[PDB]
Amino acid sequence: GGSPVSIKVQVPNMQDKTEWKLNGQVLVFTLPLTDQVSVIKVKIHEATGMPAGKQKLQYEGIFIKDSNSLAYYNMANGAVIHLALKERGGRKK
């Protein structure tokens, strides 16, 4: 199946919001391509203290889901997941 690969997280630029440390940085980790992107959200919560319940997943500018896996988005060693603040229910276009 999917092997472990390096995945980065392009954190948002929000260092003055509350208590976390979001400064546009990248957080790298190693996870199997079969691990749903939802794993990444946890990795930021350790690297910044921001809970996964309020994070937006993106890969190369593509809004990915937490239920999708890295293999589904063709991600591999050196991939970059842009994190954004998302705490609201959103809205129609």
Curated annotation (Swiss-Prot):
Compartment(s): Nucleus; Nucleus speckle
Tissue note: Ubiquitously expressed.
Modified residues (Phosphotyrosine): Y59
Ubiquitin-like domain location: 7-93
Tree of life domain: Eukaryota
Domain notes for this protein: SURP motif 2 mediates direct binding to SF3A3.
Task of the protein: Component of the 17S U2 SnRNP complex of the spliceosome, a large ribonucleoprotein complex that removes introns from transcribed pre-mRNAs. The 17S U2 SnRNP complex (1) directly participates in early spliceosome assembly and (2) mediates recognition of the intron branch site during pre-mRNA splicing by promoting the selection of the pre-mRNA branch-site adenosine, the nucleophile for the first step of splicing.
Oligomer and partners: Component of the 17S U2 SnRNP complex, a ribonucleoprotein complex that contains small nuclear RNA (snRNA) U2 and a number of specific proteins. Part of the SF3A subcomplex of the 17S U2 SnRNP complex which is composed of three subunits; SF3A3/SAP61, SF3A2/SAP62 and SF3A1/SAP114. SF3A associates with the splicing factor SF3B and a 12S RNA unit to form the mature 17S U2 small nuclear ribonucleoprotein complex (17S U2 snRNP). SF3A1 functions as a scaffold that interacts directly with both SF3A2 and SF3A3. Identified in the spliceosome 'E' complex, a precursor of the spliceosome 'A' complex.
Name of protein: Splicing factor 3A subunit 1
Organism of this sequence: Homo sapiens
